[PDB]
Design a protein around this nucleic acid. Sequence first.
RNA 1: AUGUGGUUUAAUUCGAUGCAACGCGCAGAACCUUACCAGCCCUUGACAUAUGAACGAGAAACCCUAUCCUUAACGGGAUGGUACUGACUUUCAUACAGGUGCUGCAUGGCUGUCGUCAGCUCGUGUCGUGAGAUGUUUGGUUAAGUCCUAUAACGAGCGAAACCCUC
Lengths: 204, 113, 101, 51, 467, 244
Amino acid sequence: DKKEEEAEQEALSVFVGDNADGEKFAKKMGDEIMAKLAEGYEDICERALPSTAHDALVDAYDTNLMIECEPEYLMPDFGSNPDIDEKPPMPLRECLEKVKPFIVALEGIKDQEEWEEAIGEAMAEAPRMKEIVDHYSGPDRVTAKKQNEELDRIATTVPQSAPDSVKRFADRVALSLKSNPGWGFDKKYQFMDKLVLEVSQNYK
Amino acid sequence: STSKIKGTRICIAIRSFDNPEKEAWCLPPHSRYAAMPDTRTLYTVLRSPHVDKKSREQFEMRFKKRFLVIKAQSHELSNKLFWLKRYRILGAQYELQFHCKTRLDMSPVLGSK
Amino acid sequence: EQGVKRNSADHRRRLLAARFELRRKLYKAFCKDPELPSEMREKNRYKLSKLPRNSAFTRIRNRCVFTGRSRSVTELFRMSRICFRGLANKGELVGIKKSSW
Amino acid sequence: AEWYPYDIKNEDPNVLAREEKERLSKLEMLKRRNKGPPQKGHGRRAAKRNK
Amino acid sequence: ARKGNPISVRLGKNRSSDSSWFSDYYYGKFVYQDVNLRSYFGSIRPPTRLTFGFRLGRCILLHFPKRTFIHFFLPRRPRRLKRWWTTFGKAGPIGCLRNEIRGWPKKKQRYGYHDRSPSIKKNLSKLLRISGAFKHPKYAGVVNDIAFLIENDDSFKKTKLFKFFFPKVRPSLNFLVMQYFFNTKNQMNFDPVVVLNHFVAPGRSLQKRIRSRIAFFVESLTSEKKCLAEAKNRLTHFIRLANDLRFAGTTKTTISLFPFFGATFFFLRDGVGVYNNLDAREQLLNQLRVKCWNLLGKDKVMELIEKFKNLGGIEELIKVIDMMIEIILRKRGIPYRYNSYFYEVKKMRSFLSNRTNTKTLIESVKIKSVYQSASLIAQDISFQLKNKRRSFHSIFAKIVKEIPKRVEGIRICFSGRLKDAAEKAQTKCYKHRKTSCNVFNQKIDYAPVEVSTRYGILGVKVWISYS
Amino acid sequence: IEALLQRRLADKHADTDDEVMDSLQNQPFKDDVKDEDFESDFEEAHSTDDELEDLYNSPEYVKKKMQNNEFFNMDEKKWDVIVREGIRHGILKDTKECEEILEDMLHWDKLLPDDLKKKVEAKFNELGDMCERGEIEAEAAYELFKEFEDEMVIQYGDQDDPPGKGPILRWQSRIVFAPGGDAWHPKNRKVKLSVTVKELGLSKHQARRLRELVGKRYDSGKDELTITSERFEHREENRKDCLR
RNA sequence: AUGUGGUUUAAUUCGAUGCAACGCGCAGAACCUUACCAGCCCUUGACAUAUGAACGAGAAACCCUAUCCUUAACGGGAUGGUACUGACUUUCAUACAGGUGCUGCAUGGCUGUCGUCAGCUCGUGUCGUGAGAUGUUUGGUUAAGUCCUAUAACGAGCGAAACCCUC
Ligand SMILES: [K+]
Ligand SMILES: [K+]
Ligand SMILES: [Mg+2]
Ligand SMILES: [Mg+2]
Ligand SMILES: [Mg+2]
Ligand SMILES: [Mg+2]
Ligand SMILES: [Mg+2]
Ligand SMILES: [Mg+2]
Ligand SMILES: [Mg+2]
Ligand SMILES: [Mg+2]
Ligand SMILES: [Mg+2]
Ligand SMILES: [Mg+2]
Ligand SMILES: [Mg+2]
Ligand SMILES: [Mg+2]
């Protein structure tokens, strides 16, 4: 068993070089910025050197986010009614303030400074979660009220010099496209745009 | 009683190629159990890659379905949905049906009575 | 692009038809309203006739994906009868078992 | 347009390397006995017509 | 009307398929994926002269919503028995360098494989390392008493919590931001109060109760703005803050409530694998430190002392050692003692997961002999005939001699140009003990294989019966 | 490290070092594994099985291995048991104060008595009257008076169908849990809502005009008006369409 | 109505030929399919891999919700706009790619038939110079070497029956 231990020793010593410089550094400045550099090395070691447990917990997090953040599984509160009027959403900074005493009583938070530090770390971590939900959920939804408003608007973008039959045709084509769930919205407005362009080619 | 559960509830429809009763442990707990008729689809193929018209082999595809009823009140539906999103049933595809009741607001239409 | 030499022309036809699906539906939509002006109907009929004929959905033939056979192709499995029987005897394609009665 | 799917063997680069090695090896076993393809533009009918 | 495949008659009863799923809208994708994956896996690492090779016997595929599970079965290597620190060439030849309303929707697919997609694991790792690092002293106390409980109390072991948690940014605001973004991106009205039922487990302070009710009433009835005289009142309206800070106390316990990270640990439970390299991690932890500590300082201390004398911005040397540790890990190439088999398996799971948009898993099993499936036996016979060393009678004799017990009979057929001098192809069939295929409660397995030869294609068929 | 330290000091090629980091972190290398190294680690990573004896019943073996996992399928009863035991062992915190404050956030206008509501409202009116003048040191003394009279008010104080009222709707909605990582199913976007006509209290002529406007969405044996929407691409959109 | 032979034609694509080919391959020929014929075209090609040159630090090909002109049509020529390229794009060269061309009398795999007829063999033992025989030669019963009895034979294996599905 001499061969493998001599091989690992000759590889290890030639990896480690000469041990004058580490002790010279130990003598040069002191131990406190070495403690700082050791904490820096510690935060490197959870990025640079791979860990199987780190990758497995990343995979379990990926699975949880994949099931949770799916747009096809969404079901809202079961004791509420739809918001027909489509009120704009209140902002996130105001949303975090009307939830305050529950999570203060729950999570800890001994005083206002601890509270503001928690708010700081949440607000600074927030922008990359937008990229996370961009990867998982998709681009956006765009409500059907705005979709029908856009489809009605491009129907009103006809030139005036056309006959009224063409205008009735455009409004009727928009009306029959309004209630089609088998078409993409991009294809719908592409269809309306091409119809308007084809009429405007001859009704300048 | 044995009367039908009508109200706030969950209904699970499970479709499979095999019998779900073979592995009963992966099913969610439920109040009622029932089964649907099996459905078969018939294929008749020629045996030979050339002219042997009177020699056929007949295959089929069989579909099986099961129906589960879960009684649940209004507060715990959002609690049960989190776990119902993450189940693993063996060789099956399941269907979550939600029965819940809300109330009507009459204020913007009461002027017309 | 997909590997089978005999499916190459039909794959090209499928891509070319999926490209021109939008214009075909548009000119077919213009030609079907009789209250519309006659010159506009004539122009849209001309533009529909000028489209590439290989972009028409009636030229697309179902072929087997493993082999390329042009006849007896089940649309659910996308395989011909010989490939279907060979894979079903072993016990590969799920669901399909022998049948007796 | 999705009728012809994608073959998952195309992403692993080992198997295409072995397949191309087999194609090259067959071509060389044909070339070592002078039964390979002729020069393009120098076919047998072209050489007979030039003869 | 001829003899058929044995598997087709006893497929339903006495046997089970290698896959388990169901679909109706997505049948054509899965029926192609099964055939394509099983055709791919059998052509990986063929045996050379000096390698036993990858011999896949049965591949088991289970499909679940967004989670797919694969089980491989391989025989053990038959063999009679008796560095990383300096490597080169495993690295880079070049260090590189010399619609607002009119949006687009999510593209769908139904029949095949998805397109090639960039990953998100870098962002997930970056989130997890600098968020929720559990190095806080508020989290330091709980692991101390859980260590006390595990080493001394048996009622902690006989408890369902141990059996789940150990099978042998604070997290609340993170979920709140998750829920807010997920509701506003899909444009559903987000009430944060009903989200608080997630942080709820249904299974003296009435003065505080009435004070909280009136402190919520004073924030409900107000907020009629555009008045500075009552904005002074808003400035002295910090009894909402009294309601905020009324319920405060010193906490000794962390949170294992709110089932959203409980599900993450539930997923961590069932996909750990069997391999970990913490020993090889901790062996490099204390040796790369003394490597990087003595590397710099080689009669080049002038730049370091210039950096010291400039200002207190020494923390860019952390970025310097980041660059150097990336350089030293990239030069050698591949992790230190990470198994190449698990490297190839992980590399396999990565492209499967990316191409299908699931989280696939691969679990391997090692079995005792090659005589446990007809597919394995036929692959062995084909590889033995690929280089001509033995005769067919010798191969059948060897198989009969070293067959394991519990096999109740065997039969092998060879077809093609068996004799080199003759050109007319014939068939040779060898049999042993019982191979009655016409009994439906027997356990008969069958497999073919084809061999390329000098003179065409040879064919091998194997029937094997089990007890 | 000398060269990059010097260029850290120079700070002129700072646009290059970040791309050095990107290239060293992202660009692939020659990750080849020879087959002897592929096989030599496999047998030291896995041990030989002892109970198979054949690969005929491989799926049943795998299914039994998954059946033995007690935490294969998990539900809220299981999470409730494992959250009760962690509270009992002292590692977990009771959430009684959290549900007490959540009940306060949800329902305060139902439990607060109106005779207290009107007197605290009059107190807010008089304190907002005295805050505008600013002669009462309204930044802190007004809050102190608020606390004093709030303590006085608290001393005076300390001595199946849905909630609310109105016609009741009934909803139906579907979620298809397909396997394989593709989630969209055509049955996703259908929403139904059912209502009783007689609960709206319409007149007879209004009911006749409703029946004429409806047609066969009205069922006479149950007095059931049922509206179904599939014309929109998302489930909530179809729900809103049903209500409109 | 449909298939085949024959005949005719620019082509009337080919295979299948007593039982065991001929409403067969073809579970869908107007164009496509199509393998046949006439014209109009192309030549590292509609597609792949490798090598060697040329161009390009963002140009060119590429693509589009594209537009116009000209072709019987594929294509070809212009005009717009977006985006990308250095271990990476294109252009050219040569190894080639490609073949429903021949051989089913070189093959694998798959199938029809004798035939759901009850048959075809092997290990030890005995008889015969030997090829071989007995076992499987008696008397009956059975759909059946299925079962009994008898027998220089004693036992096996593939087949029969039962196990399987359905009423
Ligand atoms: K004998
Ligand atoms: K019989
Ligand atoms: Mg071919
Ligand atoms: Mg067709
Ligand atoms: Mg002929
Ligand atoms: Mg014949
Ligand atoms: Mg043609
Ligand atoms: Mg034709
Ligand atoms: Mg040809
Ligand atoms: Mg023959
Ligand atoms: Mg012939
Ligand atoms: Mg006989
Ligand atoms: Mg005899
Ligand atoms: Mg017998």
